[PDB]
Amino acid sequence: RVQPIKLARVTKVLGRTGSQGQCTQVRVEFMDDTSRSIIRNVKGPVREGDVLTLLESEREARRL
Amino acid sequence: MGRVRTKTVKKAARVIIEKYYTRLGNDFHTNKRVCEEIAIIPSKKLRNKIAGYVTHLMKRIQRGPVRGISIKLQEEERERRDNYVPEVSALDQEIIEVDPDTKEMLKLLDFGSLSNLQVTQPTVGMNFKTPRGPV
Amino acid sequence: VRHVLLRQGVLGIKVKIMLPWDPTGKIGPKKPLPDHVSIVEPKDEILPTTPISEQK
Amino acid sequence: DIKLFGKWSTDDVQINDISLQDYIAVKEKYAKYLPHSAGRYAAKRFRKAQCPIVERLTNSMMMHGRNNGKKLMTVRIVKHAFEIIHLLTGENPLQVLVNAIINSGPREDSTRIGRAGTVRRQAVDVSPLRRVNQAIWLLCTGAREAAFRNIKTIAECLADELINAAKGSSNSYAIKKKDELERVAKSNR
RNA sequence: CCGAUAACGAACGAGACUCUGGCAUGCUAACUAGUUACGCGACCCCCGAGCGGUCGGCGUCCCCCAACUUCUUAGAGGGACAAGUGGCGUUCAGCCACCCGAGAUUGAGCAAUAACAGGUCUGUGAUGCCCUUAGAUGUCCGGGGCUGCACGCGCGCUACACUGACUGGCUCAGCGUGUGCCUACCCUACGCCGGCAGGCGCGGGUAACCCGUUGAACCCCAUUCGUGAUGGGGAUCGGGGAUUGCAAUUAUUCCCCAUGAACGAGGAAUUCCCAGUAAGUGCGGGUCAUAAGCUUGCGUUGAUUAAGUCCCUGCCCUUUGUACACACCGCC
Ligand SMILES: [Mg+2]
């Protein structure tokens, strides 16, 4: 029933966020489906072309 | 980052390019050597900053008309402007599109009924003027 | 810097004079301003004539 | 052909998850005899990912002021702890360290200071580089806390910390802290 | 800085500049610097090497009786410019990445207009006024004080331990000081005595010549200890011995043997910091007859995190509002 942990690869970096620069928003496409892609805010040093894991499918989508 | 060149180097580079464009070239290590004798530069750092900007500006000049003057580009302009005069004028067209409203004006000036004039059909609809405001 | 003693107190005088540049070094210094770039003026040296060869 | 500390070839180690393959540096050109190759790894962003992971462990293990420049002692400690983990498990200490890092690196966290909503504020994902950094930091902190006021040696406590993290037994300080962080991130979703 | 332009032409500041660090087996040189090579040696191997291995042992500017400058020293120069390539950008100013390269942001110094009732009259034979000027607020001498303690605060040092302490062995620096105008007081090798602090003789050095090849600490390798207020910590305190000085009591400092107190990582708060940096760790200089828990420098080991933001604290520019202009610690 619960959604399994999946993987998403960063394609683009959408700039910092978090009121202190401590997060960066990145557009990530799921390794399962190349077409399906969302935007998520992540912490730590991120560069385009790296894979990060997701414990949930949807959390957030906004443009600053 | 932090590689902005100031007035002291930019004006000097422009002046020496204007004066010695022929001697100057695309080689940084040769422009730094010609800068030894074409001008008195107190500091080696100043002289090679100037030489680097000179090479950059010459790369720009070889393609386009930079604000720094050059006698070859100036004479090329002075050629293009006074030349490419067409063998036949664009003002000796055999037929001329003339609106009937414009036709009556020549009648008073008794220069109408010329062969080169062709009385057209004026547009009907008066559909000029853009729609007002938004949309 | 010089002090002047007046009946009311002390007046401090500071005088700074920017010396003029001169290659002789007597009326002032010899080195030019570090940011001053002086460009020598060339001659014409156009030579648009036909290629000849002087024999000497 | 390299044999870090004279033994335990590096080429036999396989990285488990794709997310940390580019950031865990154990194989091929990341094959050095010693975890002491000071080479200006902080001069640019994303350069410590090219630093071999044993050297990162060594750098993180010397902390709390009392031993800050003593990197030779830390190299010795890592060498011994590798001997103990090989003795206990029978498998490659480098593989054990890699698996411990994979299992210790948290996958989510919390951030934002918006009046401290529920636990911190709003849940956030973590980058692979921060996963590796936090895993190494958690392992070193767990070993240090385990070996502070007791007879067990730093090498032994580092060994058992890495072993428990690699097997995921939740008997490790790093695993417990990671679980707590994931729990509060879930609450701050 | 590029550009737009009722502005044009300038001046200061920034930058440029000076010193320092990084590279030059390229040049100039070196008995107050060395390296190689050779000759004497000393020790090991000797089966058998022998152009064998070690020598901070002696020599070859003790002038005819070797060369060279890599190491060291320091001068002249060179070298790096966003210069080359790719992308972004008006394709402008520039930005990002990469190659080659020692180096693609090394640190400092200097530093505008205007101002503060900021600090110094206890730096000055800088100084206006005022006070005192012989029972002196001048100056000198003796003694005491500046240290004094129910308490609060700031800069620090040592620690709370086993990533440790003790004992022994081994092993590596760079800054820089050194015999005094007055002015008396230097750095110290070596030998002897003592357990130590020290003492007693002999030198050397006014200095790349002597200390000194600065045998530094940490670190490294072995020993003991075993999670305890314990061999952690060394506060407090007794007794004894030296050194400086005219004088050591309110202990100047140092040495030895005893005492082993709090302290088991510290609340609210809060400081500093981005690469040879923080930190650990010693060594110089200043003060110094005697002296560093201070400061100014130097080396040694040497990281975690970050290449962002305006959230807090502030700063700069523009617009805006103002009843403020002693300028929001305002005004009312
Ligand atoms: Mg003891």
Please name the residue that has the structure tokens 């080479």.
Answer: D39
Residues from chain A contacting residue D126 (CB–CB below 8 Å): 42-44, 52
- Say which residues have a Cβ less than 8 Å from residue D19's Cβ, sequence separation at least 6: A7, A50, A51, A52, A53, D128, D131
The resolution, in Å, is 2.7
- Give the residue among D152, D20, D42, D38 at the shortest CA–CA distance from D97: D20
Fold of domain B2-62: Diphtheria Toxin Repressor; domain 2 (1.10.60)
Q: Give the minimum alpha-carbon distance from C33 to chain B in angstroms, rounded to a whole number.
A: 8
Q: Give the minimum alpha-carbon distance from C22 to chain B in angstroms, rounded to a whole number.
A: 14
Pairing of strands A23-30, B39-40: unpaired
Q: Tell me the backbone φ, ψ of residue C23, rounded to 5 degrees.
A: -65, -20
Bases along strand E below 7 A from a protein CB: 1-3, 14-18, 78-84, 92-98, 105, 126-129, 160-164, 218-221, 226-227, 264-265, 274-276, 278-280, 300-311
Cα–Cα distances (Å) from D148 to A62, D74, D123, in that order, read 47, 15, 33
Long-range Cβ pairs for the range B28-32 (8 Å, 24+): B28/B52, B28/B55, B31/B55, B31/B58
Q: 3-class DSSP state for residue D103?
A: helix
**Subset of residues 5-34 in chain D with CB less than 7 angstroms from any atom in strand E:** none
Are D55 and D25 in contact by the 8 Å Cβ rule? The answer is no
Residue of A nearest to D189 (CA): A59
Q: How far is CA B44 from the centre of its chain?
A: 36
Tell me how far apart the alpha carbons of residues A30 and A32 are, in angstroms, rounded to a whole number.
5
Tell me how far apart the alpha carbons of residues C9 and D60 are, in angstroms, rounded to a whole number.
67
Q: How many Å from the N-terminal Cα to the C-terminal Cα in chain B? A: 47
Let me know the angle formed at the C-alpha of D101 by D95 and D102, rounded to the nearest 5 degrees.
Answer: 90
Residues from chain C contacting residue B43 (CB–CB below 8 Å): 34
Please indicate whether, in this complex, the C-beta atoms of C34 and B12 are within 8 angstroms of each other. no
Are D83 and D91 in contact by the 8 Å Cβ rule? The answer is no
Tell me how far apart the alpha carbons of residues B8 and B41 are, in angstroms, rounded to a whole number.
11
Using the 8-state DSSP alphabet, how is residue B115 labeled?
T
Q: Hey, is the C-beta of D109 within 8 angstroms of any chain A C-beta?
A: yes
Tell me how far apart the alpha carbons of residues B118 and B100 are, in angstroms, rounded to a whole number.
9
B31 touches strand E (CB under 7 A): no
Number of residues in chain A: 64
- How many angstroms is it from D117 CA to the middle of ligand 1? 54
Q: Hey, is the C-beta of B46 within 8 angstroms of any chain C C-beta?
A: yes
- Give the residue among B1, B3, B16 at the shortest CA–CA distance from B49: B3
Pairing of strands D122-126, D108-111: antiparallel
Q: At what angle are helices D93-104 and D154-167 packed, to 10 degrees?
A: 70
Torsional class of C9: left (φ above 0), alpha (ψ -120 to 50), beta (otherwise): left
Tell me how far apart the alpha carbons of residues A43 and D126 are, in angstroms, rounded to a whole number.
5
Domain borders along chain A are 1-64
Please name the residue that has the structure tokens 């580089």.
Answer: D129
| Tokens (6 digits) for C18 | 């920017």
Tell me how far apart the alpha carbons of residues B90 and C19 are, in angstroms, rounded to a whole number.
67
- Say which residues have a Cβ less than 8 Å from residue A16's Cβ, sequence separation at least 6: A22, A23, A24, A25
Q: Hey, is the C-beta of B50 within 8 angstroms of any chain C C-beta?
A: yes
